[model samples]
Target: VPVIKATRMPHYGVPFKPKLVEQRQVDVCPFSFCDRDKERQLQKEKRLDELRKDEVPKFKAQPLPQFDNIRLPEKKVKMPTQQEPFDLEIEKRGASKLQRWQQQIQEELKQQKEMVVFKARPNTVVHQEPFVPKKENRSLTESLSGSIVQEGFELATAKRAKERQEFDKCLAETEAQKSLLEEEIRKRREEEEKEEISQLRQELVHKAKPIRKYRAVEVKASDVPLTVPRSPNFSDRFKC
Candidate 1:
């Protein structure tokens, strides 16, 4: 028997036309998987081409300035001068401050000239001799009192007398020192004043000297005689 050409049966009964395989459209401009450098080069080339043709961009020429033929007026309009209002209170306050400053300066200067002494002893020293209690005649009742009481009284009196003596001595010393210090300070002040007075008098004498204002003689360079000494390099015989 002759083998007739057998037709293969489809895997799925009568396969439907395979869905048309279509290529995905890709952007020539920047996009994923696109050659960014090549795209930029092409875009640059297109821009240059447009610039050469002047089709993509254009610029307008600047307009020329127009000047008018009007003449400026020669006569100037004078504006009125404005005067500030006078404030008497402010002026007085400023003057008062200036005077106060001057006074303060004077006071400081005066204080600088004066000597300040720190007093060692502010309180007056009791230089007078201590009071000595007069011995009292024993009363009849005191004579009858116990001897022990009399002895104790004598001891206390002696101690008080010794203390009084020492205090009087200290006071006398302090008085002496204070007097000496005062004398020294007085002498110093006198010396300082004398020196200042002498200096002031000298200054006054110097200032009082007559100011001799003589008429300056007008000496012209041509009128004045010029003396030129011969140079040492020239021989003495040749020197003029």
Candidate 2:
């Protein structure tokens, strides 16, 4: 029987069921597990190649949109036509020409009418009044108006003073009312506090107190029990 040597596993790892009949270095051992893996990978690659040959072609891209043919609408600006020089001149002279024709025709018509002649006569007898004028009463009326103005000024001053006194009285009454309101509020608060204190006192006085029970003992000869009989102490007697 060949004695097999126990060896530590190599850093590359030991292959399962290695064909080494004698102990050797891990690299020198003739063992390979991927023998079928290469054949399997080749089969897989061949099958993929066949499948690729039978597959449909990828989608073809369409031609890019023709951006050069895009056109914008032309702007149609409306320019005003200029007036002719002759038209401007005619417009300037038309009004004056019409006025000249009208004036000439009016003068001709006036010359064609007949004129009347008058003779000089003596001056007629006329009567004139004396230059004296009536007197004015403005000064008398001005004096009366001044007196009325003075009276109005005095009445207005009296009325203003009376209104001021009334205003002062109104303010004094308002102040008195405010003081009375504050006094009422203070009295109301004091009454409420007094009522609360009285209610608290009554509740405390009416509170119940707990009662404790007590007992007094009376000794009697019949209440006592009989005493038990003594047992034999043989061990204690033998020891003595």
Candidate 3:
């Protein structure tokens, strides 16, 4: 029977289909199995296939290298580094952190060297005197306390003088105010008395006017006798 060309994928119970392939129709994509490298790749694939199918057996896998084999030469020794040190590149492109750090370390070392005084020789004559502390006549606290006491006395005396001056000024002002009030009271009383006396004089003069006229007429008649004829009763009354 003639084999049929494969046009679709085979299903269950279907016979295998013959595939048509052309030499020029080979896959040009690098990753394709039909490429020129396929022969070499197929050898590797066949080795894997043999590993899977057990047709040709695979070799035993070798153990990987240990940490010691990969360890750096410097890590193996306790001695200082002998391998060529990394030369500092002055024309480095990164931020100047390393140079700044080295400068700071050098400055710190210089400061520490300056902070300590070294005696190289046993008979080295030191120009500076041995740190014999100054023998103070008074302690710092005592001196401060004396100064504080003196300042407090001066401040207190000044305060008292200022308060006394203020008191004298206030007293003078009070006396002046009291004198002004007294003068005002005296003026007011004198004005009231003058008004009262003038009112009393006007009332007395008005009351005595009629009585004064009657007394004047009586004194004039007494001074001159009356020449008119008198009644018998009047004559009898007058005979004494």
Candidate 4:
């Protein structure tokens, strides 16, 4: 019996105690959940009362800005413009657009006038006439062809006349140019004659006597032809 220890069946209805550490913790901080929650609620209530007390705050009345002491310039308002204004930059853009519009309108009007629209009208003289269809005739076509051929001949004759007129005008112009050269030649010949006349007059006016004084030809000296010198007879009585 000593070697195998005696087994005892302990008391059945007894209270149990926890460990000392757990017991110390429970006593040190009692009612941990409920006490902390009640303190947080009390702190919230205190903060709310502080806010409510400052809801209607009392402020000091500060001085307003002195509008009278600050001077401002007079406000000059112009009335609505009644006539055209001279704003160069503003009118520059508008003028360019207006000129472009005017040009386009002119082009449109010219083209509109140039283009003739031919449409079937309700009140034409052709509409008033009764519709009578005519058969194509070979004689009518022949007559039209004859008139066209005749006109072609007349046109060729007209062109020939114009060509002749042009040639005549060119010939007249050439003759006019040629007449000036002919006139220059005639003028030169007349100038040579005038120079010869001047030389003869100068020889007659100032000279001592006839120099060569010979008619070596087999004819009488009185009948001999002299060029520009003549015999001087100032009268032998005076012995000149």
Candidate 5:
């Protein structure tokens, strides 16, 4: 049996196992543990001083079990091409230039109508009197013509004289009738003028009423003075 010393664990840590027997070791003392039952119960600590000098315990990492719930990374998407914007120039061309073209067409149509009126002289023709002397000669030639012309002319002249007398009577009657109609027209015109004059007079009177009624009241400049009268200037009768 061998006597042994009780030792604590090293600063590094205790190793799992040793190989050499107590006789072959050199670093730590070989007579290390209690050999008997009573000394075994005394609890001898084994320090591996003889095995490897200053040997630290090596710690190896372990792999955990692989999980069934692992996720895969998502794939990247490419960006789409943007559409080109509509041409605003098309809208501008239609509105500004097309409107100007249509206006020019309208102006051309107006000029065409005015040209027709200019060439035709429509208003002048509508207002002028018909040719009287040529119409009278044409009337005579249509009615009568040589030796019969003299007789026919005499007969026609006599009939024309009677016609002229009857025409004069009719003319007088027409003049009288026209005079009556003209008198009625003149009376109506006069009445309208009278009414217009009355309205104008009423308007004038209405406008003038305020001016006539509101004459400006005035006082002489000498009546008022620079300073008001005091007790020293007071008087019983009218005084300055």
Candidate 6:
């Protein structure tokens, strides 16, 4: 930007015409020629900027701060006060950088705080059951009624006693019925597997063309067992 107008006099004038000084008729130094258009363009831009800048009002009036009107330079430096003590008390609840970022973005975009209001907490109420001793458990209805009375009355512990004898009787009856069925089925299968396999074994041993026993005996015992005999057999006792 040419702060002042381009230098008024011609630049580096090969003064008074150079041919006079050299007498050779050689050209004047090209460096001495003006880069006329480049400089003129810049100079014109500077003039327009200066002209437009003045046309603009230097300190156009802007609205003052929300609370601090005078907004003196001194006031701007000082901190602001409590209005429901700073949005920060609200901002403090969600303190992580990510949480703060969310709060700030919402505050900017929608003009809403991270928490909408200070009130609305401790909305508490729920059902709870009563417990009995090792004998049996307490009923929920008895406990509920008793609790309301005691706070208005204590009857659940008394109610729980009745359940104790009932539990043993109920418990015994279930085991007898299920136990009989379970035991019968268990023994039935035990005999079934034994009878099925031994019956097969009897047939397999007797048949001259034994289709399965030849393969089965190989599994049951081998001539020279891998380990010393645990079976009571002549071959194992008398020989190897």
Best by lDDT: 6
* Model 1: lowest-lDDT 10 consecutive positions: 59-68
For residue 158, what is the lDDT in candidate 3?
29
Residue-by-residue lDDT tens digits, candidate 5, 1-240: 122221223211122112111112121221111222122211111111121211010100000000000111122101110110100011232122322222211121111111111112111110001101111113222333201121111222233455555443344333322221121111222333321221123222122112221111211111011111111112431123
Query: What is the per-residue lDDT of model 6 for residues 43-133, given as tens digits with 9 covering 90 to 100?
Result: 1222112122110000000001111111112223233321110111111221222233223212211112222111111100000100111
TM-score of 2: 0.09
Candidate 3 lDDT over 181-205, as tens digits, reads 1211112123433222211232232
Model 4 is weakest, by summed lDDT over 10 consecutive residues, at: 55-64
For candidate 2, lDDT tens digit of each residue in 111-142? Answer: 11111000011110000000000120011132
Give the runs in model 2 whose Cα sits over 4 Å from its true position: 1-167, 187-240
The whole-model lDDT of each prediction reads 0.17, 0.16, 0.18, 0.17, 0.17, 0.19
Query: What lDDT is obtained when candidate 4 is compared to the true structure?
Result: 0.17
Candidate 5 vs 6: which has more TM-score: 6
Per-candidate TM equals 0.11, 0.09, 0.10, 0.10, 0.11, 0.12
**Alpha-carbon error at 166 in model 3, in Å?**
9.5
Ten-residue region with minimum lDDT total, candidate 3: 57-66
Cα shift from native, residue 26, model 1 (Å): 99
Model 2, residue 37: distance off in Å is: 99
Clashes of each: 0, 0, 0, 0, 4, 3
For model 4, how does the per-residue alpha-carbon lDDT over 7-49 read when each residue is reduced to its tens digit?
Answer: 1111000110111111112123111222332321211121112
